[PDB]
């Protein structure tokens, strides 16, 4: 589901920056190591030259030229690794900007993601409320009210239906009552 | 405003509902009494 995928992408970015941080460690490891190499190399060059310089005056001259050839060969190795160092340096700062660029991407993606979810979730909640408030076209609570109101109207009808019979015998009987009723009215005329 | 509108709907629905039930229940009770009083057409106590 998109909710799950979306936060998963956030989680992925957290792994990514961690991977890039060690990758930084790997490149920097070679900067350190290649400093170490040049530092050694420059010593080695001097050292055997020093042996050779005494060897000029002392015993075998010829042997000193061998030591110098070894020295010089190694000097070439150092210069070759100086070439490699240049590649390291340039690549390193390229990687530094690439991390910063990714960090910007992540930062924006995360903030956008958060407000995207929030404003969407808020909107749907509002819509659910307006629907349930409104009942546009039809609203079931009124239909339930109506059902029991139909029963009221039925009972109302039925109640006056008992009245509909209740009247129609009585007129015979009532006439006898009214004769008696007139008598007490005649007693009032007597008292007057 | 939508809450206030609903609150009005609820308030009226409830008061209407209450008096609807009461007046209906009162009416049926009256009708039951008038029937049992009257025996219009026939009345079993007179038959006994």
Numbering used by the authors:
A (entry chain D): 24 to 215
B (entry chain D): 120 to 167
Paper excerpt:
A prominent member of the PspA family is the vesicle-inducing protein in plastids 1 (Vipp1), also known as IM30 (inner membrane-associated protein of 30 kDa). Vipp1 appears to have two functions: in membrane maintenance (that is, during heat or light stress) and in thylakoid membrane (TM) biogenesis and/or remodeling. Vipp1 binds to negatively charged membranes and membrane binding depends on stored curvature elastic stress.
To obtain more insights into its function, we analyzed the interaction of a truncated Vipp1 lacking α0 (Vipp1 (α1–α6)) with membranes using cryo-EM. We found that, in the absence of α0, Vipp1 forms PspA-like rods that are not capable of membrane tubulation and apparently do not interact with membranes. Thus, α0 is critical for membrane interaction and tubulation of Vipp1 and in controlling the polymer architecture of Vipp1. Membrane tubulation of Vipp1 is largely mediated by α0, as truncated Vipp1 (α1–α6) assembled into helical tubes that did not internalize any lipid membrane in the lumen. Although it has been reported that truncated versions of Vipp1 lacking α0 are still capable of membrane binding, our micrographs and cryo-EM maps show that Vipp1 (α1–α6) does not engulf membranes in the rod lumen and does not assemble on membranes, while it may still be capable of binding lipids in other conditions. Additionally, the monomer orientation and rod symmetry differ from the rods observed upon incubation of the full-length protein with membranes while the Vipp1 (α1–α6) rods adopt a SynPspA rod-like symmetry and orientation and cover a large range of diameters. In the PspA-like Vipp1 (α1–α6) rods, however, a register shift and a larger distance to the next layer of monomers would make it impossible for α0 to reach α1 + α4 of the monomer in the adjacent layer.
